[PDB]
Design a protein around this ligand. Structure first.
Ligand SMILES: NC(=O)c1ccc[n+]([C@@H]2O[C@H](COP(=O)([O-])OP(=O)(O)OC[C@H]3O[C@@H](n4cnc5c(N)ncnc54)[C@H](OP(=O)(O)O)[C@@H]3O)[C@@H](O)[C@H]2O)c1
Ligand SMILES: NC(=O)c1ccc[n+]([C@@H]2O[C@H](COP(=O)([O-])OP(=O)(O)OC[C@H]3O[C@@H](n4cnc5c(N)ncnc54)[C@H](OP(=O)(O)O)[C@@H]3O)[C@@H](O)[C@H]2O)c1
Lengths: 318, 318
């Protein structure tokens, strides 16, 4: 079930103020994506670089408290790990009846970090592409989930935000908060971000440990990957399989099963299971409560890897 | 050591005919990339779709025999597995003194499938991006290796082909036939093509087996990957790490090491070792001698996967 442009009409927002809370990777694009489509947008963000960048973007930047007080659609675009602190201290006491409490990721609702009152709609519009892309695509996809419907229009108000940001153009698939949260987390951990970077690093290190030039390993392990995945996007694995040599495609077939075994699949099911049982959520929540001793260290190590170091010069010249 | 535009001058090709043998993924782009840069190109290909597509591209399409006879630079752009059959039956007897025998992949020279005579230069220009990209980039990278220098200019004649195709613009890194062959094969088997498709499929199947909607699994496992890798290209892992949520980056750190273990690294070293010992080459060579009973079956299975099936509708609408 996919809602499209004919399923939505932003007219439900004519005269309705959308408070974009936060102004970062998603906050800046969606606020400017609503901007063109005649959506009256007010940005609620703490003072800082987001505050003045949204100001120079021509918006009405105010505090999170004042933004909730003067809006009917509160769109939560702070970091997932900051949303509960800001909510109870600045949003909750200012929520009124019929307001929409919107998210673009279901983490804080699904794992009980934000417990909204009963007189607001709780819905989600989760775009699949990062901000900058949502911005420029509109200037010329997403999931929708309705957690709590108090007005009877939360689905159609959320599709007016989908239409306002312009996701009904490409198309919006309906899901739930649980299903979006669980699969969004699993994808970036097991495949998109955790698996691929670990796979790129392992290949790179096998070549450098094999005596091969580090700059050569950078090309065939990381740099050629963009060209490999672009073809996958346009037409799946089949298209990418056809642009590459039969020598490459045959290597794919006989080597993929060696790299990703039945044991890798069993570990992915454990990753998924820990997501479903809130165990990852707990890990990330307590991680932030502890002052990120683990996130900061591992972030610095990943940036000190030779793949990232040798990657500097290589990208400069060309 | 990187040769650049100032290191090459196509003038060594003024009045020199470059015979592009084959007209496919690489043949069409390089022949048209040389075309604009005043390079006199003659295409030598068997009759068929490549023969008439090169004809409608305005070239002088002739047989492989006649192309070698009337050219001074023979560029071998047939499939790696067809080059030895075509060579001995159509190239070898027509090679003369001072001709350049060029490749864009070192497989057939490094694994002793083509044994060139002593009176020709043997060199390589291996572009890192597939054809279509080489074409349009020139209209507005590569490795260079010199296997046999008989004229004393094979390196500078090959950089005139690099300049003629336009790789000296971005830049060309010098390698050997062995090093290009070994790492090109290892990259596509362990990382780019074999590892990633196996990793995408394993994630997708974990979600579908987990009860999740197949269309939802397509987005977070395959479709979002292009947007993930694009960021990696522009600025390494660091850049991609920053566009994604801290919730995503923290998942990366704690999950990558679970998916790609010390055991995955040991298996990659076995993949590499089998490449270095000619064992993969033998496998692929005998595979083709047998009538591809293994390549065809596995190709059909990969195209019948649900990820590719569900991928159809999803890409259509948007
Ligand atoms: N591409 C994605 O990463 C992606 C995909 C879909 C949906 N989402 C979801 O969208 C939401 C945010 O995504 P994001 O990646 O856009 O977050 P972001 O890029 O980190 O933007 C962060 C914003 O939060 C503000 N902020 C941080 N702490 C604050 C506080 N204590 N009080 C007030 N404002 C504060 C920052 O202002 P300063 O500049 O002052 O810190 C900045 O404007 C998350 O729920 C995320 O899961 C993101
Ligand atoms: N992106 C890459 O795949 C890539 C990367 C760098 C370098 N290379 C290297 O470049 C070379 C070819 O790459 P490719 O991927 O361009 O090959 P390709 O796309 O398969 O092009 C195949 C060409 O070979 C011709 N051909 C096949 N069998 C023939 C025969 N028996 N006699 C004459 N012509 C024949 C085809 O003509 P029909 O249409 O008549 O079959 C077609 O023109 C290989 O050495 C490859 O490793 C490729």
């Amino acid at each position: 079930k996919t809602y499209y442009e004919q399923d939505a009409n932003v007219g439900l927002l004519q005269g309705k103020t959308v408070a974009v809370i936060g102004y970062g990777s998603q906050g800046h694009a969606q606020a400017q994506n609503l901007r063109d489509s005649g959506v009256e947008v007010v940005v609620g963000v703490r003072p800082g670089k987001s505050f003045e960048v949204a100001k120079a973007d021509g918006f009405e930047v105010m505090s999170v408290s004042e933004a909730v007080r003067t809006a009917q659609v509160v769109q939560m675009l702070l970091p997932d790990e900051q949303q509960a602190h800001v909510y109870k201290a600045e949003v909750e006491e200012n929520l009124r009846e019929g307001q929409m409490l919107l998210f673009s990721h279901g983490f804080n609702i699904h794992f009980g970090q934000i417990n909204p009152p009963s007189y607001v709609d709780v819905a989600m519009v989760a775009p699949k592409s990062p901000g900058h892309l949502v911005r420029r695509v509109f200037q010329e996809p997403a999931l929708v989930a309705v957690h709590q419907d108090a007005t009877g229009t939360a689905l159609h108000v959320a599709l007016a935000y989908a239409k306002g940001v312009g996701c009904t153009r490409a198309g919006v698939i309906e899901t739930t908060f649980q299903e979006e949260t669980e699969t969004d987390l699993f994808g970036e951990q097991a495949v998109l971000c955790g698996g691929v970077t670990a796979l790129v690093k392992a290949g790179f290190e096998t070549l450098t440990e094999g005596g091969y030039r580090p700059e050569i390993a950078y090309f065939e392990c990381l740099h050629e990957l963009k060209l490999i995945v672009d073809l996958m996007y346009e037409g799946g694995l089949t298209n990418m399989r056809h642009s590459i040599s039969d020598t490459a495609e045959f290597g794919d077939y006989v080597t993929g099963s060696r790299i990703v075994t039945d044991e890798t699949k069993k570990e992915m099911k454990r990753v998924l299971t820990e997501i479903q049982q809130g165990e990852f959520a707990k890990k990330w929540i307590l991680e932030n409560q502890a002052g990120r001793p683990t996130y900061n260290a591992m972030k610095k190590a990943e940036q000190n890897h030779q793949l990232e170091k040798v990657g500097e010069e290589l990208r400069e010249m060309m």
